[PDB]
């Protein structure tokens, strides 16, 4: 179903604050923002999809995603907040992309 103004702004907000949260976890943990983002995304998408990203310096496998996930969950509550923020951020991103798919069709029909 198509979003509303409040829903759109909500998802957008969660996405932006999610990316900010990823940057925060990068500042805290000292890891690569791309790696953290890909791990969070991996946990959001679930066991359905795991694949190596060309940009990452390390290969992406469930062992690694578990290591990094448990490495993120070992943080204190205030630092563990950004994890939840990032997760809900990725979820919001998925819902946001899935919501706008009609626009793409309406644009592509002219091409």
């Amino acid at each position: 179903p198509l979003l509303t103004l409040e829903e759109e702004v909500e998802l957008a907000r969660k996405v932006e604050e999610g990316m900010e949260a990823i940057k925060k976890l990068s500042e805290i943990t000292g890891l690569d923002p791309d790696l953290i983002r890909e791990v969070v995304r991996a946990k959001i998408l679930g066991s359905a999809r795991v694949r190596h990203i060309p940009g990452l310096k390390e290969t992406l496998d469930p062992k690694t995603v578990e290591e990094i996930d448990q490495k993120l969950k070992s943080l204190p509550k205030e630092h563990k907040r950004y994890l939840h923020i990032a997760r809900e951020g990725e979820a919001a991103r998925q819902h946001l992309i899935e919501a706008n798919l009609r626009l793409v069709v309406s644009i592509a029909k002219k091409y």
Binding site: L5, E6, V9, E10, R13
Partner: protein, 52 residues
């Protein structure tokens, strides 16, 4: 409103009651579509705490 403590002073044919009263005064806040509520239902806030 509920009366917590009641002090009574006897004067002539009358009594003067000093009432310690506790009540709640409601105030509405209209929320626009571009704003989000950061507080849960029935939560206790304080002075300076952000609601919306």
């Amino acid at each position: 409103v509920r009366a917590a403590q009641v002090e009574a002073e006897e004067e002539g044919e009358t009594v003067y009651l000093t009432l310690f009263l506790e009540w709640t005064e409601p105030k509405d806040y209209r929320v626009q579509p571009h704003m989000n509520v950061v507080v849960p239902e029935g939560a206790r806030v304080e002075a300076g705490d952000k609601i919306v």
